[model samples]
Target: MNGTLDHPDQPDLDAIKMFVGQVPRTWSEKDLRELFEQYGAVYEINVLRDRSQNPPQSKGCCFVTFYTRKAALEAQNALHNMKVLPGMHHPIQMKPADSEKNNAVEDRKLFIGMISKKCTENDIRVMFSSFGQIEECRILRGPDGLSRGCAFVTFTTRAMAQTAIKAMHQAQTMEGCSSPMVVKFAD
Candidate 1:
């Protein structure tokens, strides 16, 4: 339920989860909040880090979420590609996080079923590589560390996924698979 009891203000549904890059490692959340507050209400700001380090060093990048979409756009327009932060050669980089662009490339990801139990991630790659650039390839596995006869493959473009689906779906069965290989856009 969307309840306002916890916090009086909630970020807009369309508000972007912005990726802020080229940041100074020494800056803290408070410092970021102070800097970003000028553009709009910062709903959340998280600085990535390497927790394995002795002092948990910063990753020089953070995610910023504003209370409204307008604020996010304003901040992006004003700060993106602008040299504002110290200790950085490149200008600050602000853009929508990959997770925020889900709708743009959802069709590029494929659900590959009827796979061979022995299939590896590399096998999936080899099968789908010729179609297009493979962005991500993951074979499902059980707790015992065996393939689940299914995998998820993501291509760099939707057209590539479509090409693979057209060429491979129900075309040929893999070793030990009863039915033809199943390839289609991931639901």
Candidate 2:
């Protein structure tokens, strides 16, 4: 598309939504908007919540929509694997909001965490192969080119993914780490 936010080829909303985990309870919408404005023009910012939780509570996650695809893409690329809060090991997960509705694409992708920085793609492939055929296994990396300690692995079938989750969810461990891997449906 063109540099203008309203390029005819792009959707009017042209949003990029991401999950910001480990967010502090004290933060407000204004605080979030202020933080992201430095990257680009943020048209909208929202902190998600669990409405059913009695009094309801912040889910420690949010979505930011930029004015243009370029801004959203720039934010996504730069912040994908960043720590939402200091001293938190889990980095926020960023992805295209459209992907959430694309069932065919998400059915094959699995979110994995607790990755050891020293591990490689080959290690991931070899570790999860016997459960079923793997389409691709990618470790999320940061702007610094180091592992974000998480990954997304796509399996050939939903059953294979389920089997892998059931079998390895609590037992998967990395070479240089002691904590078991965290496997779950990606948000």
Candidate 3:
């Protein structure tokens, strides 16, 4: 539907029974429960998995069901305008339980593997900028601050990401690095 309730302030929880959208991949069920529990009693939670990965990693999205409409309403008010979650670089975005699915993460994000540890975000930006407008470029690192040897690049559209994959997937090098570049959809 429109992804919103007629009366967001007082929606009928029975009709939809849940809310769904993006969450940080690093968050566990406990984290979600703790964040949402402040509003009211949570009935259930289902975090979606990224089947695209071999081990089926968390897709960074989930469905949350509250025991009552009042609880859901309280959460909606707090989460909708929230711009910064505790451990997330970006704010969480949620919509009604019956809202149309959001595949933006799958469509717009790309994985660049085997990238040189020396490669900078600006280097990636300049290289991928030709394909499309980049929304974000992140080189994952460990707590020790070491590069994970891979990065996630996000574009504004699926078409743009597709172009990048086709052009760079398993390719033998990119600007700003001597090693081969591997590009694929981010799981």
Candidate 4:
């Protein structure tokens, strides 16, 4: 009998994807774990070691895992395209759990802002519900519980995000608020 190639122990080829980031050559394991643990529970951390030497040194690439799918999604939405460490060539890169899949990948990101001071979660939800799916919506507020004048709305797909950007951005306006709506993806 031949040993079967299939096994449950095998990783989900798609989920085998990990959140990747670049750190300075001097970054330590302690610091790598510190940065990622904030967004989600860290499952395991893999820092790409040097390939040239037998006991590889630091190569400045790190992969992290989160506890839940939702957590992973949240982290991805929050950090995508944003600098993991700005001004440092080693900015962070957040990607899907299926990063290893033999499939094509797409970039879907949109940032909606210039919201009024009185907007609520429900209001925001209603605004973009027509999109494919809303990953998350957060309102920036002041300590006095007043709107700080902005919010972030993330959509599930880049296509839907882009669609929303084209349809509503710059064209949408509130009755009392003076600022115009702005929707653009993070760099």
CA-lDDT, candidates in order: 0.71, 0.67, 0.67, 0.64
**What digit string (tens of lDDT, one per residue) describes model 2 on residues 21-104?**
645546577987787787688776777777727587676777777666677667655664432434455444444564553434
Q: For model 3, how does the per-residue alpha-carbon lDDT over 69-122 read when each residue is reduced to its tens digit?
A: 666666666654333457546656666543422434444678877766656777
Candidate 2 lDDT score relative to the true structure: 0.67
Each model's TM-score? 0.45, 0.45, 0.44, 0.47
- The lDDT leader among the candidates is 1
TM-score, predicted candidate 3 vs. hidden true structure? 0.44
Candidate closer to the true structure by TM-score (higher is better), 2 or 3: 2
Off by over 4 Å in 3: 1-70, 73-107, 141-148, 174-180
Candidate 2 segments exceeding 4 Å error:
1-13, 50-55, 81-85, 88-153, 161-187
Model 1: lDDT equals 0.71
The collision pairs in model 3 are none
Question: By TM-score, how accurate is candidate 2?
Answer: 0.45
Cα RMSD, model 3: 12.5
Total colliding residue pairs, candidate 2: 0
Distance from true location, Cα of 63 in model 1, Å = 18
Candidate 1 lDDT by residue in tens digits, 1-187 = 5765744554335666777776655555788777777878787887887773868766578887776777766766676433355544645666566565444445467887677778888887997887868888888877677777778887888887888887778475744455687688866
